[PDB]
Every structure is written in structure tokens, then in C-alpha cells.
Amino acid sequence: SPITGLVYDQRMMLHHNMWDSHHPELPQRISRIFSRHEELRLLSRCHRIPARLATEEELALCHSSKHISIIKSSEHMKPRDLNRLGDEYNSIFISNESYTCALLAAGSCFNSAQAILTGQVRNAVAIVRPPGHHAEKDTACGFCFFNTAALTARYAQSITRESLRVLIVDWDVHHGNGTQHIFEEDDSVLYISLHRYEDGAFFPNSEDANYDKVGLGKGRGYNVNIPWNGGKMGDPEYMAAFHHLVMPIAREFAPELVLVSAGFDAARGDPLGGFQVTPEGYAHLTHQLMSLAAGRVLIILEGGYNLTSISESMSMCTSMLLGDSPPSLDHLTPLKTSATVSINNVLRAHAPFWSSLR
Ligand SMILES: O=C(NO)c1ccc(CC(=O)N(CCO)c2ccccc2)cc1
Ligand SMILES: [K+]
Ligand SMILES: [K+]
Ligand SMILES: [Zn+2]
């Protein structure tokens, strides 16, 4: 079924910051990504998957009733009360349409996972906002209300079987604290994150993101953090992390579905990330993941704030999903010594759990 699905809905643009029309998490992130897909004739090659609202019962797969009800209630708030509610969270703005856009983003991803798991398509891309991976069971954080990726893994298990093996690869420049916590005790969902860490000083500013956090109880080994220290990283570092860590661990895990928390704020041009991963870089990461899970890959937009960088990067990913050949990747410099230390720290930490690690 060599078809690639694409899901996008303009209604997700309604979510906005009422006090700063220029806030980085712009409604125009998704519309510019979508337009580039059109221009490059990628959209027309895809099977268009309908967006939908997630239900409250689906939200409850990962989130508490209290958290759901609080975010639901913002739908009817006056502007000053929205400001106050948003200030109760770390790095959140809320509008009357926020709840609905968050529901659309999750339901769009559920329909995509269903299309893949029932064989209607091989793989899919979801152009959605607001993002999800900083969201926790009981709280909103870092522009995220509900954890779209976490929900989707659980949704997928719910329409297949409880023990469906799901891999979540999170290449957003920030650590997905919410995703790690939701599955920390879980051995059916393998969470792998690459992220700027700087010894805990980079958002979300927690030692939860370090390499030594390997999972808990039966989930021991099923949480893989690859923290970057010492400034700018690029294609050389990310390709080396995939070669030595991500792809060997993923092959041993043998996932049946791969979800990508695909933020593009590690891209060159992005002020919030400060890294230099190129669009060709992201193409190669995507292409490697396609060798897993009989090709069952869902790419889900997280962060990424340079409108041109994210449009070109995510388009490049969809092109790989569609079966185009990978672009030339420039002379991969020897790694920064810092990156080498990071990769060796993860290798040492995970040697007890993954026999295939050399
Ligand atoms: O999802 C994200 N990036 O993909 C993301 C999540 C959270 C942030 C916040 C964040 O990182 N910062 C600090 C920037 O140096 C911040 C800025 C202004 C006000 C409050 C905090 C930035 C990005
Ligand atoms: K990440
Ligand atoms: K896990
Ligand atoms: Zn991010």
C-alpha cells in the first residue's frame, strides 16, 4: 500500500497569542508548511486524510480529568481570565480557540495512525499545531496543551492490541518531558529524544533530560535521552547519534509503528534552537526511520519557528516518505568532542539494556 497520507486543517490556525501577534509559535507555521507542500507538488502526490476532533475519552488515555476540564473551560473565558490562566503555566498562552485546535491536532493524528495501521496508507505526515511533547498528564507547558504524540501511541494500541510496540523518536531541539514521563514505566513504548541540554540549563531546564534517566521498573531501558552540551550541533552529530544509538536500539526493539515528534527548531535559521541541522539532514533521518516497522511511520509537527526553515525541512521529510531518493549530504566533519562525550555517555548508560550496542 505504497501511499503517503497527509493531514492538515486550517482551523488549527485559530489558536493565537492575543497580546503578541508576533509570538514565535505563529498560526502561519502550519499554513506556510502546507503551501510549500503545494508548490513542490508533494501534496498532490499524497492521500489526503481528514482531520477530526479528539474526544474527551481519548484525551483521558494520557491526561487527568482535572487537566482536561481546566483547558476545556478556557473556551468560554474573557480575555483577562485567559491571561491569568495562561500565567499559571510555564510558557503558555491561551485563546478561546486553543482547546479546539488542541483537539484537532490530536484527532488529526489519530486518523493518520488509523490509516497506517489498517493499511490504507504506508506512512503519513501531520501538519498540526499547537505542539504536544512538553504537555504532561496533569499540566500544560511550553506551548503544549495535550501530548499529541503520547495520545497517538495509546490510541494506536487501543485500536490494535495493548502490547503494540510503538517507537517515539523526538528530534525537536527540546526534551519532550511530558512524553518521557507518560511512558517512563512502560516497556511497550520506546521513547528516544535528542535535545539541547547544556547541563540542565536549556528549556525545560530539568535533569530529567539527562542520559542517566533510562526508565523505571519494567520501563528500564525504554527511555533513551541523548543530551547535547557545548553549543551548536549539526548534521554530523545527528547522523552519528542515529548510527551509534537510535537505529541499533530501534532495530533491537522491533517497533510496529514509528511516531516522530518532529520539531524543526534544531534547524539552521531557528533562533530558539541555535543548531544547524539542514533540510537534507532531516531527509536522511526520515529515510533511516523508514527502514523500521515495515515502513509504518507518522511524522508529527512539534516546534520549529523559522517559517522558511520548517517549510523546507518538513517538505524534505514528506518527499522521503513518498519514496524519493535521499539528497546528497555534504562532507560530514569529525564530531565536536562534546558530541562524542554525549554519545559515549548514552552508550555506557544503555549497554546493560541493549545487547546490540557496541
Ligand atoms: O516548544 C518549544 N520549542 O519547540 C518551546 C517551548 C518553550 C519555550 C520557552 C523558552 O524557552 N524561553 C526561554 C528562551 O530563552 C522563554 C521565553 C519567553 C518567556 C518564557 C520562556 C520555547 C520553545
Ligand atoms: K527532542
Ligand atoms: K518508555
Ligand atoms: Zn522545541
Q: φ and ψ at 212, to 5 degrees?
A: -80, -5
Identity of residue 108? S
Q: Quote the radius of gyration of the chain (alpha carbons, Å).
A: 19
CA distance 191 to 180: 7
| Whether the Cβ atoms of residue 108 and residue 52 lie closer than 8 Å to each other | yes
Residue 2: CATH number of its domain: 3.40.800.20
Q: Which residues surround ligand 4, an ion (CB under 5 A)?
A: 172, 174, 263, 265, 303
Catalytic residue ranges: 134
- For the CA of 166, the nearest ligand: 3
CA distance 339 to 353: 22
Enter the resolution in angstroms. 1.9
Reference 277, options 196, 217, 352, 355; nearest CA is 196
CA distance 86 to 297: 34
* Cell output for 240: 552519528
For residue 79, cis peptide bond before it (omega within 30 degrees of 0)? no
Q: How was this one solved?
A: X-ray
* Cell output for 127: 501538519
Which of 89, 93, 272, 301 maximizes ligand 1 atoms within 8 Å of its Cβ, making it the mutation to test the pocket? 272
* Cell output for 139: 499540566
DSSP 245: I
Number of domains present in the structure of the chain: 1
Residue 130 CB–ligand 1 contact under 6 Å: no
| Whether the Cβ atoms of residue 140 and residue 89 lie closer than 8 Å to each other | yes
Reference 293, options 244, 259, 322, 243; nearest CA is 259
| Whether the Cβ atoms of residue 228 and residue 139 lie closer than 8 Å to each other | no
What's the per-residue H, E or C state across 317-337? HHHHHCCCCCCCCCCCCCCCH
Domain encompassing residue 169:
1-358
CA distance 79 to 36: 34
CA end-to-end span of the chain, whole Å?
Answer: 36
CA distance 192 to 169: 5
* Cell output for 7: 493531514
